[PDB]
Amino acid sequence: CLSGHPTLPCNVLKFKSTTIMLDCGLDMTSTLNFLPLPLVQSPRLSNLPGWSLKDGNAFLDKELKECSGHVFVDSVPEFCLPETELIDLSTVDVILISNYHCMMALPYITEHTGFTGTVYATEPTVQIGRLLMEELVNFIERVPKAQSASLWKNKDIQRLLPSPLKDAVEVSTWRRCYTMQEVNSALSKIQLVGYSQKIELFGAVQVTPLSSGYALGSSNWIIQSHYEKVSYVSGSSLLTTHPQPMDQASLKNSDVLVLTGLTQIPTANPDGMVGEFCSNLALTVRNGGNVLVPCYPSGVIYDLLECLYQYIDSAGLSSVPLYFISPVANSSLEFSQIFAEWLCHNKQSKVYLPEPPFPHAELIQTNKLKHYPSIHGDFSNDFRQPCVVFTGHPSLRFGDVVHFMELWGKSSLNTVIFTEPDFSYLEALAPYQPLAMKCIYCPIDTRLNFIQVSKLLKEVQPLHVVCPEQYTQPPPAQSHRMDLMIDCQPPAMSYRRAEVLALPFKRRYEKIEIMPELADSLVPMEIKPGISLATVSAVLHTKDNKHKPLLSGSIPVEQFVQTLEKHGFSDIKVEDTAKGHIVLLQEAETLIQIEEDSTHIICDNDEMLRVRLRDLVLKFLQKF
Amino acid sequence: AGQDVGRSCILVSIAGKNVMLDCGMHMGFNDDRRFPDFSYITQNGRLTDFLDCVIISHFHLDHCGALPYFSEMVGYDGPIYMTHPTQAICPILLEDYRKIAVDKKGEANFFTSQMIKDCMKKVVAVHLHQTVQVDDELEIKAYYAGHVLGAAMFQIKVGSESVVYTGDYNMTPDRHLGAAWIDKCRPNLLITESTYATTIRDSKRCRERDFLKKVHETVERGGKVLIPVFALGRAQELCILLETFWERMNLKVPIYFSTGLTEKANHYYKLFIPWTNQKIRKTFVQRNMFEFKHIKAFDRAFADNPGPMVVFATPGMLHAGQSLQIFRKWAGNEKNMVIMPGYCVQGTVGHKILSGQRKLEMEGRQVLEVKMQVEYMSFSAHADAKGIMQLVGQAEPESVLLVHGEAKKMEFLKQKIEQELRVNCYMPANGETVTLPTSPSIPVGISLGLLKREMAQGLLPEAKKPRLLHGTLIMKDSNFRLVSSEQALKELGLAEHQLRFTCRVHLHDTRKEQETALRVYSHLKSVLKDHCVQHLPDGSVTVESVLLQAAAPSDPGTKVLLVSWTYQDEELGSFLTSLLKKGLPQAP
Amino acid sequence: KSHQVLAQLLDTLLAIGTKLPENQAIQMRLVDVACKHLTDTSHGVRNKCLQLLGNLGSLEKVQKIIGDYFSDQDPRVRTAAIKAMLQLHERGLKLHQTIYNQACKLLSDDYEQVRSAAVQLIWVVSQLYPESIMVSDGSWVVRVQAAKLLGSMEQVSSHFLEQTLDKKLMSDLRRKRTAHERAKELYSGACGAFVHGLEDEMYEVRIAAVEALCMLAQSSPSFAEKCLDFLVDMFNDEIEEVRLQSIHTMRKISNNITLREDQLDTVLAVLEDSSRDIREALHELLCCTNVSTKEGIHLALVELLKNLTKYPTDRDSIWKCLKFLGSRHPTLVLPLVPELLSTHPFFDTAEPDMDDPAYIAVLVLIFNAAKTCPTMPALFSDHTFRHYAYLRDSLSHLVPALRLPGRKL
Numbered sequence A: 001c002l003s004g005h006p007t008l009p010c011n012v013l014k015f016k017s018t019t020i021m022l023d024c025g026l027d028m029t030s031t032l033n034f035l036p037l038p039l040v041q042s043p044r045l046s047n048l049p050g051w052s053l054k055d056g057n058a059f060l061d062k063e064l065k066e067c068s069g070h071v072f073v074d075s076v077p078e079f080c081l082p083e084t085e086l087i088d089l090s091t092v093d094v095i096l097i098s099n100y101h102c103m104m105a106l107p108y109i110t111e112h113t114g115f116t117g118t119v120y121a122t123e124p125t126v127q128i129g130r131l132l133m134e135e136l137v138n139f140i141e142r143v144p145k146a147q148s149a150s151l152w153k154n155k156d157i158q159r160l161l162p163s164p165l166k167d168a169v170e171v172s173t174w175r176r177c178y179t180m181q182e183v184n185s186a187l188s189k190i191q192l193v194g195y196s197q198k199i200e201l202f203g204a205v206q207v208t209p210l211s212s213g214y215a216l217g218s219s220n221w222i223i224q225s226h227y228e229k230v231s232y233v234s235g236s237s238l239l240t241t242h243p244q245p246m247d248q249a250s251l252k253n254s255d256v257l258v259l260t261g262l263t264q265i266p267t268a269n270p271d272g273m274v275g276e277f278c279s280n281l282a283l284t285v286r287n288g289g290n291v292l293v294p295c296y297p298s299g300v301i302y303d304l305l306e307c308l309y310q311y312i313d314s315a316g317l318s319s320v321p322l323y324f325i326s327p328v329a330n331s332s333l334e335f336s337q338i339f340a341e342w343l344c345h346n347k348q349s350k351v352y353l354p355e356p357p358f359p360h361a362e363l364i365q366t367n368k369l370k371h372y373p374s375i376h377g378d379f380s381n382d383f384r385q386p387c388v389v390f391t392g393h394p395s396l397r398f399g400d401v402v403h404f405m406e407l408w409g410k411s412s413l414n415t416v417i418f419t420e421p422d423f424s425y426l427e428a429l430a431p432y433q434p435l436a437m438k439c440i441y442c443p444i445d446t447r448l449n450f451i452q453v454s455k456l457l458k459e460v461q462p463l464h465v466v467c468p469e470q471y472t473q474p475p476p477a478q479s480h481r482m483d484l485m486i487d488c489q490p491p492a493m494s495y496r497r498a499e500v501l502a503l504p505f506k507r508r509y510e511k512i513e514i515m516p517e518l519a520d521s522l523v524p525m526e527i528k529p530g531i532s533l534a535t536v537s538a539v540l541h542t543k544d545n546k547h548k549p550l551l552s553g554s555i556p557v558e559q560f561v562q563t564l565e566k567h568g569f570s571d572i573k574v575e576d577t578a579k580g581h582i583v584l585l586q587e588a589e590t591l592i593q594i595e596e597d598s599t600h601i602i603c604d605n606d607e608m609l610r611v612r613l614r615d616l617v618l619k620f621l622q623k624f
Numbered sequence B: 001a002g003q004d005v006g007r008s009c010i011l012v013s014i015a016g017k018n019v020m021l022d023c024g025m026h027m028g029f030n031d032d033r034r035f036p037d038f039s040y041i042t043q044n045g046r047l048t049d050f051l052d053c054v055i056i057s058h059f060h061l062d063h064c065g066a067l068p069y070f071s072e073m074v075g076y077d078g079p080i081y082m083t084h085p086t087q088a089i090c091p092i093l094l095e096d097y098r099k100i101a102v103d104k105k106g107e108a109n110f111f112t113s114q115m116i117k118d119c120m121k122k123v124v125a126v127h128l129h130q131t132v133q134v135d136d137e138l139e140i141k142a143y144y145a146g147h148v149l150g151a152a153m154f155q156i157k158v159g160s161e162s163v164v165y166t167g168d169y170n171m172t173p174d175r176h177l178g179a180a181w182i183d184k185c186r187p188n189l190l191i192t193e194s195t196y197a198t199t200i201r202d203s204k205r206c207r208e209r210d211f212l213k214k215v216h217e218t219v220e221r222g223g224k225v226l227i228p229v230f231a232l233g234r235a236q237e238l239c240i241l242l243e244t245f246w247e248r249m250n251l252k253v254p255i256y257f258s259t260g261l262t263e264k265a266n267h268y269y270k271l272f273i274p275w276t277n278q279k280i281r282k283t284f285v286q287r288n289m290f291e292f293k294h295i296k297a298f299d300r301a302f303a304d305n306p307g308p309m310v311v312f313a314t315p316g317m318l319h320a321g322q323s324l325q326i327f328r329k330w331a332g333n334e335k336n337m338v339i340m341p342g343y344c345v346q347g348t349v350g351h352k353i354l355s356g357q358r359k360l361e362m363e364g365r366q367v368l369e370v371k372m373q374v375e376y377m378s379f380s381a382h383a384d385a386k387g388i389m390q391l392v393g394q395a396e397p398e399s400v401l402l403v404h405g406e407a408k409k410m411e412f413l414k415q416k417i418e419q420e421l422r423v424n425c426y427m428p429a430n431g432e433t434v435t436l437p438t439s440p441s442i443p444v445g446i447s448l449g450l451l452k453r454e455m456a457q458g459l460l461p462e463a464k465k466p467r468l469l470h471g472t473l474i475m476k477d478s479n480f481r482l483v484s485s486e487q488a489l490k491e492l493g494l495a496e497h498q499l500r501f502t503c504r505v506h507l508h509d510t511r512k513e514q515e516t517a518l519r520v521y522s523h524l525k526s527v528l529k530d531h532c533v534q535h536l537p538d539g540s541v542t543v544e545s546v547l548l549q550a551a552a553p554s555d556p557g558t559k560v561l562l563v564s565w566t567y568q569d570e571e572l573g574s575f576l577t578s579l580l581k582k583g584l585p586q587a588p
Numbered sequence C: 001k002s003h004q005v006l007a008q009l010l011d012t013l014l015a016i017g018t019k020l021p022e023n024q025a026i027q028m029r030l031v032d033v034a035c036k037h038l039t040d041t042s043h044g045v046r047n048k049c050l051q052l053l054g055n056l057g058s059l060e061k062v063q064k065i066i067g068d069y070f071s072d073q074d075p076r077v078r079t080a081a082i083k084a085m086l087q088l089h090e091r092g093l094k095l096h097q098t099i100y101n102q103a104c105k106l107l108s109d110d111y112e113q114v115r116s117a118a119v120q121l122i123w124v125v126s127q128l129y130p131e132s133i134m135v136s137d138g139s140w141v142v143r144v145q146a147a148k149l150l151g152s153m154e155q156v157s158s159h160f161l162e163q164t165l166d167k168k169l170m171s172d173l174r175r176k177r178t179a180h181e182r183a184k185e186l187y188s189g190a191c192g193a194f195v196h197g198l199e200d201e202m203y204e205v206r207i208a209a210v211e212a213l214c215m216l217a218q219s220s221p222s223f224a225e226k227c228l229d230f231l232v233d234m235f236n237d238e239i240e241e242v243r244l245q246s247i248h249t250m251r252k253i254s255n256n257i258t259l260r261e262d263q264l265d266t267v268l269a270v271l272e273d274s275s276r277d278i279r280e281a282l283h284e285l286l287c288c289t290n291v292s293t294k295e296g297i298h299l300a301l302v303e304l305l306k307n308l309t310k311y312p313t314d315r316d317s318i319w320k321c322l323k324f325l326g327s328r329h330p331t332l333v334l335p336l337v338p339e340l341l342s343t344h345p346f347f348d349t350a351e352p353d354m355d356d357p358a359y360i361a362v363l364v365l366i367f368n369a370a371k372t373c374p375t376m377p378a379l380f381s382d383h384t385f386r387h388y389a390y391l392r393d394s395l396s397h398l399v400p401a402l403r404l405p406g407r408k409l
Ligand SMILES: [Zn+2]
Pocket: B062, B063, B168, B193, B404
């Protein structure tokens, strides 16, 4: 006997690791670690120069925490992981997946503690996640220096001594590595799951994807029992409409409406930010040197790719090619080429060489597009850098962007324009602040803007909507509301708050199959009898008609004496009292008293008359 | 109760299912060997445009031929939607069929192109396992199966009634095929397409072995190997295997093939590339399917009988001109190989000439002299003998319907059903053409149980009692669905009727009330022991549901005992009402 | 009170009783009885008390509880039951033979994560002892093959079935039920899963299939002559994993086998790509095997010469494999001696290069095949004797000692 309660161990607003439990389903939503957290350490680079080696000494004879402008750790970035301790992984059956993003911490919970069950997701997201983990481990294992940061994690009494932004986060269990074993031994468990499937896990609860349009496979799984509408939302967008835009034809009478992904930037304009980025790239290619745009692997970068392709009809002349440095670049390109069914209905997925998502990237490949998906001796043909280079990277410490930043660190000649807003200003450029670059941070991101979730809640008319984080308060360095409207009450979640907001009391299943029985007559409730021997098989008690009801109802004395006379009885004397009626039958000396909701019969030693009177009085009421 | 009114038993299967007041025509087909008699579908059984689900099976016209041509007469804007891969192959195949047959002054076909264009772009695509929103209380889900790289079965669920229409499902795939999936839904009506029932399917390795050895034997004698197949059908495996053979032996042969609009075939095959196996998906960076060598020649006009040459004709059984006009020269030569990669019905020209017609005309009193080594393989990739029994053994069906068989082979197909009588014995009735075969289905109503039924799960487990699991919670049917145990009294607005059956038994005894009280107390602990009875201080006894007191005595020789029992255990009291009637014991 | 509280308490009891004490006298038997008497109503502690009683072994005599619970309501509790019964198995406990009958009701479960363990259950109950019953000889193998035939329906329940059959093949292995499995049409066995389990799905089950194949071919000396064809024709799989596994399963069965025309399908794995880590395995395979005629010997020799002139970075492996080939069967090269080296009956000219890495291989092959040959120097040239005299005195790990009349000792 339990209820649904989300046990979330994270306080990340972009990602989520909620676990919406149930009575017998025990389902868990997507689980993700802290991706933007491993940036305070030294960046992982090859061919260590002399500039990033000799710096200021540590504070109080540490010899493991260098300092150059800010605090840094010269060791492994030491990837973060949520607590996930007060819930054992031995009673878990399935883990949910998001849009190719929520598997960075997936192999850490598959072959470590528990989770011996199955897993359900779609093909494009799982393939992009595989490529992401592959490029991540490829960027980690290059120059694999040993861990030398296992001393400041404990003894937190002195952890608050260093400068801020370093002691704000605690250390519970961080793994820092994948060893190329669980990452490829855990991927051989995924099943082929499409959109709106009928997998029917555990024989009672059903999940139905929604396929919201944000990226290639932004599916919002909707776990639901016989009578329940638990809705989980990972990512959605109502402005791009290219990758099968979101539809609201199913989530009408939702229950909890777990909303996780948000935009976090309400002041910027997508069209305006793309326009200013185009102007910036044009003005920096007109004069100066090469251009560097540190971006993520395949996914969100495709709109920027299409914009820079269509920008060739502007003041920017030719001879401005595009380099793409990524170990999984060719695989990502061929996967975007092969994946075309997950596009829009007729706007994008036309199949007549007009996919408008990936075919345009190959249509312009014959004019000026050299791929070169490596850095190990491939640019020896021509080296002048009149181009723009995009290097995939999980963060600003693992990818090859740090080598290129140390290559042409001179300012007024290159750009450091970013595309992912899941970082900061003073910490992201902390080891590179002794420069004079423009430091532009155009936030390319469209994830359920505040102007969209408002109209979504208006057209949904929801109830008991749960808020993911404590952002119900106005954000810092801003002067506005930027909150969500709730009629009943605004909930709250934290690192270890297992709040219970649900009550499924086995509403209606009944395992109805081959039910044939009589039906009585009444005003509006035609009651009937039931059958025993349910013989349940799997989450369904199919109580079929095969091999004690109580009584209720007032019995009239007038109809009683009428049926006594017309059945064969005689010499029956009836008198009245203050509220009841007393009837005497001379045979066997039967005395019967009928009061308001009361009947009492007294007779002598006789069996046949007793059972006769019993069956005569029992057919005057309805059986319940 | 479903009707499942079939329309064909040998070729051009256009069967329809009429269930739950909903008529769905699945894979409306038409014959390809006729003359103003069977060009279109047999639409004489219906004169309206009311359909519940118009779903086609696969690409080529053996099962989907009229749904793209006869749409001008019966045009609907509803369930005419199809799956996703049936959007680019269908237009080009109907185009080449028109320019091959309808362009030679045919009897009746699609004349105008605007009607074709609108009935093609009016179709809505369906993704993998995408449950399309039907009219009401209906769902269509498409599974995966590798037959023509884009074929799939559909399951129509209309009120606890699921019917699976599978088009030419087969096992043992290859590089250009996939594996069939059933999802284990346990349906009730299985309309299957059985083609190779008695002929057991051998392994594919020896198949490629005999194919390569016969190709080598034909090339050793400088014979023209002209293989006839569909435009974009089961010929992809043929061309890829002959390409691998050519690169393995390193020969300089021609190895030409018909154009058949090849400027878009590779594009359509490599663009989606989703209805295939994994062997092509893992290595999509090497271009294993497209971008081939030694097969870039056109055997349309440059195919002259001069030396050993490998040609690929775009015809199943030499329909109009592909394998009939362009292959008539290499038919009379003693050294000529004509490999057939399909097995059509016994109504075409090439199939009839290969079967038993060693000397027959082509069109009208043509050259009948034809001596060669024409031998057809089993590369049709149709329903094999093992896949059908594996499916009927893994699905546990209740009714098996055989459609799209043959004329005489169907007589043996039912014999295969006899084998099913040992494994999946059920109502397996092979309906003929235009012969409806109804079937009786269950009710499967809908109810609504409250939380009280959960209490029935407590007494069911951790107990040894039988035949008593849910002997409570009487039905409370109303405008809505709801049953309860005690909440019915609350929702109907009344209380529990107090029923207390009372009798006054007489006992013959002259002893004291305490004596008879102790006597009846010791007697109630002898015949029954599962009932707990306590003694009151005044000198009476009371069962957990029955009370026994002593009324006013009198003749003092008789004692009057007032017994009272509540209706809840009334019958139990009846049993008690029996004991005092078997007399008084002789021990005191 | 709560559902998770009882599970946490049971886990604490298991951690406090099945990790330190692990003994008798109310250390492993009292907790098991307390967990068995703490049953629930609906999926409360069943999945937990099952592994509780699993990790607590009472004594070497407790199976009736799992026997009657094998027909419970939730199918996810059958998984806990089967893992607990496997934990009881791996400690002995004298498993009875009746469970196999119950195992029949586990073959048709209509669910996942149960049949993958049901095949393991039938394998272990067949491998316990084939008595007390035809007579458990080649009987459970038919059920295992029938369960593994539906490989396309589950990618996890097919590899486990093959891994279980790998050890189940150690039974009597009647030929009537073994020879008919290698064909589609059965000749009691009425299933396939041998010629239909390879080209069906991803290679993670093909690996287990060929593992079971080599495991059953190592024990039984027969069955190899009819499976070597199938083991050879599975090379054109365009997968970097199946190729090395085929090399391994052929090297592990390199005994009492023949090779007449199936060599071209297994040697061409070196021309399609580099295969730096597979080339040594292929060379080790080609040297330990036997060749029927001299045509295969000539083909292997010209292919090794091609690999040498195309990749001279692995000449040591080539010399070692040629040494092994010459030591295995020296007679098969006797009718090929005047054809390998360019010699003339009345000219004796065209002396090849000394430091040529193409002729030293043939020289060392001839010298290694010259061990048990009756008259080897009868067909030698003039410089062959001095070449042998120079190679023998320079290296001894590749050129053996002979009895040439020109040399001494
Ligand atoms: Zn067909």
